[PDB]
């Protein structure tokens, strides 16, 4: 109850590396660099749960 261990990044690369955040909805992990996350965000969401501009 709490775990999930799902690496769903825009990378398309299933790899737990670097600093990763948890998408509040789908409870995945994603690399801060690609999603452009701030780590100090109130609640982070992947581009699937909440479409955000991704220029990578």
């Amino acid at each position: 109850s709490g775990g999930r261990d799902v690496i769903r990044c825009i990378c398309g690369l299933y790899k737990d590396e670097g600093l990763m955040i948890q998408c509040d909805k789908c409870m995945v992990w994603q690399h801060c660099d690609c999603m452009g996350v701030n780590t100090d965000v109130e609640h982070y969401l992947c581009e699937q749960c909440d479409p955000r501009p991704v220029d990578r």
Binding site: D16, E17, G18, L19, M20, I21, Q22, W29, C32, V37, N38, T39, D40, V41, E42, H43, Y44
Partner: peptide, 15 residues
């Protein structure tokens, strides 16, 4: 934003 940092290129295995 729960931040789990798992860098595993050279330093990803403690002890």
């Amino acid at each position: 934003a729960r931040t789990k940092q798992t860098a595993r290129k050279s330093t990803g295995g403690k002890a």
